[PDB]
């Protein structure tokens, strides 16, 4: 449910970044993968090799960005409660008073509705693929990384 990537430096200190990522290999195939004669006529074709070695092809990676989560906000009678749960959360509301910021503590917005507010968890420790199905990081322009891909 969470992806962790780390390493060890020269000063013997280990740093690791953790990102919430739902990992469950799903169905992915376009055939039955089965020959085919052992000996026959030789013809030119193309296939994806099984070499894991970091060469040729590459994908774009970036910060998760601020991962949106609607479960962070809760309607406390006539006010909105933002339950942090030991995470850095970026909030924004339509209502008056405090309507922006980066909170580390539990916050409450007086006289507001859940639909009039937006909250997201800020991870900046881990890397994530530049996916069109995931939103772009708000406090970031075109800052991105790249990793070599197998097959």
């Amino acid at each position, epitope marked *: 449910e969470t992806l962790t990537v780390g390493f060890t430096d020269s000063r013997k200190i280990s740093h690791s970044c953790t990102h919430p990522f739902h990992h469950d290999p799903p169905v992915i195939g376009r055939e039955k993968f089965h020959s085919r004669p052992q000996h026959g006529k030789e013809l030119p074709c193309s296939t994806y090799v099984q070499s894991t070695a970091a060469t040729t092809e590459e994908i774009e990676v970036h910060m998760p960005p601020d991962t949106p989560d609607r479960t962070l906000m*809760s*309607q*406390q*009678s*006539g*006010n*909105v*409660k*933002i339950t942090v749960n030991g995470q850095t959360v970026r*909030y924004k*509301c339509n*209502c*008056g*008073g*405090s*309507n922006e910021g980066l*909170t580390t*503590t539990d*916050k*409450v*917005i*007086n*006289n*507001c*509705k859940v639909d*009039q*507010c937006h909250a997201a968890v800020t991870n900046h420790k881990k890397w994530q693929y530049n996916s069109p199905l995931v939103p772009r990081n708000a406090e970031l322009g075109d800052r991105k990384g790249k990793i070599h891909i197998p097959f």
Partner: antibody
Amino acid sequence: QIQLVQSGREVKNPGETVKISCKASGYTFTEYPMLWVKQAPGKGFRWMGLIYTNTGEPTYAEEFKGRFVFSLEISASTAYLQINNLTNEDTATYFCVRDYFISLDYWGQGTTLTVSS
Amino acid sequence: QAVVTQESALTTSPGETVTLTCRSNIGAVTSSNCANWVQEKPDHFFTGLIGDTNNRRSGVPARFSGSLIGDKAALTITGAQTEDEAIYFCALWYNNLWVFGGGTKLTVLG
């Protein structure tokens, strides 16, 4: 359903310590933390802090960081307020309260302390 | 480091509609202040009415509703009753602590 019943009222001469209990009934202790409020004779209502009845971490209001110490007999659904080195101007009533629904929903009966030689 | 202000006393008659307000010294009250309304009846008897601006505690009559009116949190008693004569306190959340208002003494004919 929910009853927070508090200890009875004490008298204590300056310098002493007091442990005020709050015995909770009707809810699962663990999913709702406790607010401790001071309603001072004249002055009105004041938040003293909140205790995470799950982890056990207390928050103190800055006015209360120091002589005040929140703790809990988890096991018996009790939260407790302890005021050490009692000052004479601590006479007042202290309420325990349940934090829920983006505010406080139930208040206790109050335990009144009269600091007096 | 914020000061919640409430009307001092309000007098109404049974059957009327009365509004109590809760003002914050720092700015407009918003839904992230999670306005709470608490009632104190004689004998140091406290009950919570509304939380998170407009959530009515369970078993609190419907004549009670909360909302934000302008830049402040408000409690409206629709069809005030004789039984509603008490002190109403508002509480506002400020990112890390709660600040209580001075309370409004409400008097209802009956």
